[PDB]
Amino acid sequence: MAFNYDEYLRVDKIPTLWCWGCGDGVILKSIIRTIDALGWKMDDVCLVSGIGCSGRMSSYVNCNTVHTTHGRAVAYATGIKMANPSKHVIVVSGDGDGFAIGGNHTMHACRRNIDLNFILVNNFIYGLTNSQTSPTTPNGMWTVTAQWGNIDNQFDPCALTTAAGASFVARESVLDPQKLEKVLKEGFSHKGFSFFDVHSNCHINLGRKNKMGEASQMLKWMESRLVSKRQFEAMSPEERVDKFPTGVLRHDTDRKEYCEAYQEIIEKAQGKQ
Amino acid sequence: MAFNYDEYLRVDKIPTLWCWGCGDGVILKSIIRTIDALGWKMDDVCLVSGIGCSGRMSSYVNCNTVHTTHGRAVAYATGIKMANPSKHVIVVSGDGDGFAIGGNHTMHACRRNIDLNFILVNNFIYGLTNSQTSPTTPNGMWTVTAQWGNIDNQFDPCALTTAAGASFVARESVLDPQKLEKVLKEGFSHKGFSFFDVHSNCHINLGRKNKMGEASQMLKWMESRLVSKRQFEAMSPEERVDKFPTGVLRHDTDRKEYCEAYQEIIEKAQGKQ
Amino acid sequence: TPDGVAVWVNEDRCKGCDICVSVCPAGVLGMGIEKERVLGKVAKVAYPESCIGCVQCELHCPDFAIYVADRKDFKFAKVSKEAQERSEKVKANKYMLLEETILEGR
Amino acid sequence: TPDGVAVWVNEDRCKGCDICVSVCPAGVLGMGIEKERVLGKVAKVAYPESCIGCVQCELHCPDFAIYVADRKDFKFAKVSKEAQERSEKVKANKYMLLEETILEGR
Amino acid sequence: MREIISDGNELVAKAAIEVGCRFFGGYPITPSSDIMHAMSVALPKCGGHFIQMEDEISGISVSLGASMSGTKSMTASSGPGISLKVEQIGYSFMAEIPLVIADVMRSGPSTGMPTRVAQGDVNFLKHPIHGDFKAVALAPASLEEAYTETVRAFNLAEMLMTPVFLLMDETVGHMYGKVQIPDLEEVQKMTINRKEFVGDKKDYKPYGVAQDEPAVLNPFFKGYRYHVSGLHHGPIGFPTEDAKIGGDLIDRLFHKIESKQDIINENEEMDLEGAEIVIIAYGSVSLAVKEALKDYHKESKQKVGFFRPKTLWPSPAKRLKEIGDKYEKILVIELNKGQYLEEIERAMQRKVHFFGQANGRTISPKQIIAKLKE
Amino acid sequence: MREIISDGNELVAKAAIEVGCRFFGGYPITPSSDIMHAMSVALPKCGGHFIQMEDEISGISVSLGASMSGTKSMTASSGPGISLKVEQIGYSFMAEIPLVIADVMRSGPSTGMPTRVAQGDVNFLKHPIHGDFKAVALAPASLEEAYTETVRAFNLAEMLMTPVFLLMDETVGHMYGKVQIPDLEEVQKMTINRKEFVGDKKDYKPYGVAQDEPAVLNPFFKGYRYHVSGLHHGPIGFPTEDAKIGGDLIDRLFHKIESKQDIINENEEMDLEGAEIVIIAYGSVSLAVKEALKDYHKESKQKVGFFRPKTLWPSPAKRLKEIGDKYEKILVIELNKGQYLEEIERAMQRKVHFFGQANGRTISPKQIIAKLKE
Amino acid sequence: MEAQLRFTGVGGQGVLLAGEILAEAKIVSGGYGTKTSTYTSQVRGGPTKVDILLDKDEIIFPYAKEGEIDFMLSVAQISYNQFKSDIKQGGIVVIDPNLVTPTKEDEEKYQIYKIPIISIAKDEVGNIITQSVVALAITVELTKCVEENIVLDTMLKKVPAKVADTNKKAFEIGKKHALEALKV
Amino acid sequence: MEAQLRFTGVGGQGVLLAGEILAEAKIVSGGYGTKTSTYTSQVRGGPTKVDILLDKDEIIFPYAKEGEIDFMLSVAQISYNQFKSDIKQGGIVVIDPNLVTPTKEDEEKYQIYKIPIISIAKDEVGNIITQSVVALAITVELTKCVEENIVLDTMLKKVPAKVADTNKKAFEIGKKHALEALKV
């Protein structure tokens, strides 16, 4: 939560392993801070994460952690949460996870409204396997498998999850951790499927061939791409080319959680049939 | 196209096999009519379809037809179209196909804008396997695996495919075949990914336990659920509960097809490098 | 297309689903009973003289069984209120043909 | 948290990504050359007396290296235009500390 | 000893509920749907959870995630469905997560004849995953066994901490009739739950066990905190690429199963008393064999034997070797193109006779008596 | 005879392009990514199509769909990727669609050691699908063979109309050095394309062939109209559930491969001339064996032999039987826990010696000479 | 054994659903029984059937035995043409003449009876779905395997109280037409 | 054979990338060579290495041989501590003293030389990425396996014309410090 981060960490694991300036330790810090701010106890928190570079996050925290196969974090988490419907489950995965190979699971988790806390670590390529193309890489960028310019198009995870039926959607980045923690603390207290789109930076594998090889050049580019929600909401469609609004984008309050309704089916299952 | 439907049909196959009043022969009729109206030659048309009860459609037409595994029709069709980028490919699948087990393939086909003609046969359950729950079944209905009332939520295929990035979206039903053929003829001439959401009727497996066991009761219910596009576009959010707008819902005209851009990559691949 | 016949049915592809009967604005169609077929009922054209040229029946048939002539080869009838009244009287009758329609074997 | 130290850097956990440098508005941080490590550059505090309570450095540290004392047990400095000018002159210096800064070994 | 009237799928579901299963995830496919239709009504009444997912991958993943936390669970599919779970079956084998997978066989390869009976998943389920693997698979052969073999499957999955397959067939799956099943209270006595380490003494060692026994995985959310991953791990669960640990891990994964060999595999032997011929055959062809051997004896001579394995994998290699060394004429009957014949021939170190049929139909003990004439 | 400087993946890609592959679909995974990075630059230059899909299922489905229409195509993956294509491999086997699948082996089970070498997909690829299956799999063992085995894989896939696996390894895959490869014009002479029926005489019979030969599948969009499905089909392609047709179909799918057995499997035999010991071993352990047998001879006695299969499946059972009947001491060396040892022991009807190692490292001909002492 | 019975029809009729009641009846009576059915991928309109094996001892093989099915009751042509051969020479057959017409050689071979089951179910009783009980009545009344009162009990313990009182009326009409069909 | 060479380092340095150039050089010269590398799952900051096998005959086994690697050049501690044992007794070792400190017993055993390769690459030449050419110069100059002109050719046919002219300057500085390192 503060200068004492070691209550929530497997301190024998740190120093971490990412590169030197990846925007992944910032998200871990923010998660720990917002867990403390809410008064949660680490004997109630589980953290399941897919395979990739954001899959190292489930190694450093001191709780009941799981590391799953590629694209299946949300299904294991659904099972864990359904069998223990009183504890706090958090999912962490990349953009080549649950939006490329596991987009089906994410869409159906949004649809059926399971009380999860999906957190997407968006760095716009596949980092672990050395810079392949993602469903979120912008057009024209050099990737290892598109060496004349990427021509596939892009996903908008927020619009896609909104169309699927998520109850709490929000976007932030590692360029403002206080707002990141405010969004996380408002989304953790929600009682449906909460989706957080977090823009991270991959300067080693993405920006290195697009001339953003330093961390700060990538950070300034990412800042230029991001505008607030009302900034964006006022600009003209002439002007919203490659602009992303940040903040809370949807907080449906008249909704029903999945387990809260399966409990009703359970009660009328043999409440005298 | 008319009283002579036998030019486009494997007449030795008919009579068909569906039940007695399924809204599946109507879609086949409409497809044949709109193929003739455009002047297409059946030596250029391929029709690939998944497994299920709309998968019988690829058996009766007289062309080069394919019957694939469950949820993979769009991938086989992508390959067929990419290897022969001058012919006409049409995909037909149900709502438990490319929107339940193959929703990932559909979303990525919309995203990358391949020149396909996806046609969804929407009957709101799994018909072949005797009335299981679909991602499009309304809440509260008796299904074989939800025998106290379905509590999972719904997909909107049109909104979801619009958020993914399709270029031509349209919805119609078997309750007006002339409008169905107008929509089909406008969508076939389009040069991107065309998505058609077609509401069919399953009175045998869905309506039989929800007291819509006749074909005409199911048809009146389906008519009550469907309003025009401007009807819907004028009503208040107070009033748009379970209402679906019909017609052409998106016809992007400033876009780029996938193969039309891979041809540019091909030309600068060794057009002197 | 036979001559003089505005609309005709092929009772070997009819499955008896009532959808052709429910869209006729002239009361030309009526569902008849045949115990030799599994569903029991069969569509039967009764008043082919008031047949308007709307091909709704041919567009609304799943099993390719009802056919209407070609306007270039036939002179169809006009709209009349007797026919619409008869169509409503038939719809209020489980889409079967009326008891007074057997007056002549229609 | 030792006494008087408003901010101190763990020379064993830092990796040299210049991020905590690029976010401080009081020009207190500076990157010097250290050949003992692989990257070569290491972060060292230069003017810990002009420290502002903003924890942006600790919030922008992906490697758990830089620490800041708590407001409850410390008195931080005030804002000044000379400090902001110094921060700008540090930023335009490849996030390294200025040649002028070595006058005392800052 | 209560006796009822049901078919194979109702009995599989009843045994699963009575032994203590409280979770099920699946995706619909014939002919393995009746178990899902039964569990969806049987699980909410006892307070369990049933969920129908979007594919088979999710179906097995949610069950693995629910039994990771300390809840007894299962799943079920058939053919083209089992072909989609083989990436998670390896995760279950390597992380030592108990799960029971019921596979109802139909005619293969792809789709093929989705309404016909077959025995073609034997060699597939001998080794379905990449890397190294050690299978456990049971083959019910009647209606009394559809119940007790399922109880045994749950007991073995909890005792060995490994994924156990239940190789049901469409014949037994849909066959309907009278059954005899044990006492409910006597089923409750024989139940084997997984073991948990309490101490005060936090766990400190889920995977630090001896070289011939499984791991101890305490439930989640109880104070014992550990890591669960699918890579080569150490005592507490954090991955490693050491040679010693990575080798001893797979040696233990093999030895914890091949040392319990006397408790794991049962098998049924009848009329092996001075017989001339032996008719080794498993599964539901046993139903035809037991009637061919009932008719052929009343007009003919030269007593015929029968050796039926009840646990397919791991195979009873020693008993097969002894039977092959003792008797001179053997006959293997199957519903495939010679799948389990290869194991019977690598044991016994000898060539034997074969009678197979892979056209979607059964064997009809007319044909068996006609083949015993040779 | 042109000679170049490259590694295994560059040679696989060059052979694929030169034999006539014009389509590739895949999903990135190490260590099978270099082939995709090579094909993505090599295919647009010759007018082919390269597409990177969203998973491995789509990767194999688009390649199957492109080769259904009459275009030579391939795909590639490694371990956890191949575990995801086994539902479509059965569709390729049953519908008789030529495809070549390159599998670059790494340490298993699930992810395990993603940077290490192994030989663990042998028994997995012997029978990966449900139902019945008949595999064809080649195992390159050097840099000259990474090229010619790929040409042979394409020729066999076009001659048999079936999915052929290419069992590459990480060692040979990343090993770099000097190579000798045939003449380009001489490679172009030996190419075998699939056959097409012209007539005037529309096709009328794609699957109506004799009982020991594949089907004739004319290209799409040319006037010959037929149905392609994955169920038990008849002469033109429409499904059926007849017993005669459904049985003869699988009999032909087996007999069209097991009758070409003299052309399909090659194998290399050296120093089998009065030897005392035989060191059967395949793959890239052949590199260590050929050097152990080069050092051990210059201080010792008792000539040692070597029998290396070049085509793993279907196995050379008759030659193995003869070698086992002739010689008294055999030794099988592998990089797993005894996978291909079971076939060598069911052939030869006899128990042999074994030397395995499944910890992620190689064998190092020091160890082989140390084991020949016994 | 004692009996090999067969009930054919078409997908969506319900006549053949009267088989498993007979198995329950022989079981509660003190014997053994078992049933197997044969369906298609087509939901409605396709041929279906069931086989039933009733005995005094244990039943081992669950499948019917080729070429000596004893009794066969058919309410369609697409399935009476399919599953016609497995009857023994001199077995009992019962068809409805509005939907089945047997060949001349089937009249040579079997003992065909002619009762319009569905017309009885709709015209006289009142519900289409009572055809299963009518077929059950004729089955029990012609083959005479299980006692009639046990069959009444095991039937009426199995259908809702909605139509339980009309179910006896259906059964009586069925038994009456069956006794009347002993015309020879 | 003739030589077993080893180049260690840390992920993201580029010193060890000078190995495959040496293999190309021995190949074009008229001999045989082959290389194998050892990497980790960590992208930057982890230990890496390469082995090289050069000879006058064919090369069969591609892997280096335990306990008699001849020459080892290390630019890190996390990898010099890892791969230290496989050197023969009396082999040549070359480290940079700003990032490696050998033990007393390694000074007993090997013939360690002390050259700060990366400081040479940055302070004198001007680019960080010229360290590979500098290491190549010292490698060729101390072991003396391939002729220097062939190495210059095979190097300069392999890097862009961007820095080709400074690449000779780097190589000369490297060879100069190597000749100067013959201090004994």
Ligand SMILES: Cc1ncc(C[n+]2csc(CCOP(=O)(O)OP(=O)(O)O)c2C)c(N)n1
């Ligand atoms: C079952 C399985 N499928 C695929 C892979 C290959 N793989 C593992 S991680 C990875 C890339 C990581 O993706 P991403 O979510 O983008 O991680 P990031 O670099 O962005 O942090 C790949 C391709 C695998 N190792 N296992």
Ligand SMILES: Cc1ncc(C[n+]2csc(CCOP(=O)(O)OP(=O)(O)O)c2C)c(N)n1
């Ligand atoms: C290869 C394969 N996978 C799965 C199945 C199971 N299955 C086949 S069709 C179907 C349901 C049909 O889904 P849907 O998209 O709703 O088609 P519909 O009947 O509504 O037209 C299922 C579960 C199968 N028979 N074969």
Ligand SMILES: CC(=O)c1cc2c(o1)C(=O)c1ccccc1C2=O
């Ligand atoms: C005569 C009549 O009005 C009628 C309605 C129906 C039938 O006849 C059937 O035979 C039938 C069969 C299977 C499902 C539904 C029906 C049905 O609704």
Ligand SMILES: CC(=O)c1cc2c(o1)C(=O)c1ccccc1C2=O
């Ligand atoms: C001393 C200095 O200012 C500096 C900047 C960098 C380095 O040193 C590296 O060693 C390096 C290695 C790999 C990728 C990027 C860099 C880098 O940007």
Ligand code: SF4
């Ligand atoms: S490669 Fe990218 S995602 Fe992976 S550690 Fe480096 S910066 Fe982070």
Ligand code: SF4
């Ligand atoms: S079951 Fe439903 S979807 Fe299938 S044919 Fe009948 S009405 Fe159509």
Ligand code: SF4
């Ligand atoms: S053609 Fe028109 S008016 Fe005539 S019967 Fe058909 S729908 Fe009625």
Ligand code: SF4
């Ligand atoms: S629409 Fe055609 S098939 Fe259907 S009931 Fe009417 S005439 Fe018969």
Ligand code: SF4
């Ligand atoms: S944020 Fe920390 S680790 Fe990164 S450069 Fe600054 S002091 Fe070093």
Ligand code: SF4
């Ligand atoms: S504590 Fe604040 S003022 Fe002081 S160095 Fe850090 S960011 Fe700058």
Ligand SMILES: [Mg+2]
């Ligand atoms: Mg449907």
